[PDB]
Amino acid sequence: TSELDDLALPRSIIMRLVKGVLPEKSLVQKEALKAMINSATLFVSFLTSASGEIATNNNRKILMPQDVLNALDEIEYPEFSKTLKKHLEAYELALKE
Amino acid sequence: GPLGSMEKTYGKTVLPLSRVKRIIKQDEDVHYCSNASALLISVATELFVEKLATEAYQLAKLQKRKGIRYRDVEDVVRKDDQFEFLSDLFSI
Secondary structure: OHHHHHHOOOHHHHHHHHHOOOOOOOOEOHHHHHHHHHHHHHHHHHHHHHHHHHHHHOOOOEEOHHHHHHHHHHOOOHHHHHHHHHHHHHHHHHHOO | OOOOOOOOOOOOOOOOHHHHHHHHHOOOOOOEEOHHHHHHHHHHHHHHHHHHHHHHHHHHHHOOOOOEOHHHHHHHHHHOHHHHHHHHHHOO
16 A cells, blocks of 8 residues: 555545535545545556557557547546547647647 | 636646656556657546546435545445456455
8 A cells, every 4th residue: 555655646636626526515535535546546557558558459669649549448438538539639739839 | 706607728637747657657568658648648537536436426425415435435346347447446
């Protein structure tokens, strides 16, 4: 658990994400927030791994944004795809300017 | 208060990218993860947290509660296929 704690994303940023989808004045318990912070770390690893596999299967060393988009299907979170595509579109629009 | 409706800026994450990259870097099989890839992985993580919190909250709402407890988060991972990858963490 020492490793999970060193990798953990900031408690306040995660908390804001949590409360952002709950009614006003909803509370979130101690060990619940930590449960979700840790789950978030594993989700990064989970999606990264699946994306790396798709990169490897394409005989590429660089894990590319399209590997991430196709990894959503493999890890069965295809409902994130529309939003990620939107971010990707915006990212390379801003880039070219 | 703002005078109009809320407008999201896409192409940015609210997460600290350096921290997300540190987790990404732990993967022994990845040679290099591009910045664009890191951004998308970061946004997916935001969406993931929102999803987990929503399902945890719905469980709480069933027992007429206003807040999320640890066992709400646990029961979600216990019952929902999409959260199978968390099974080790919660010792189900």
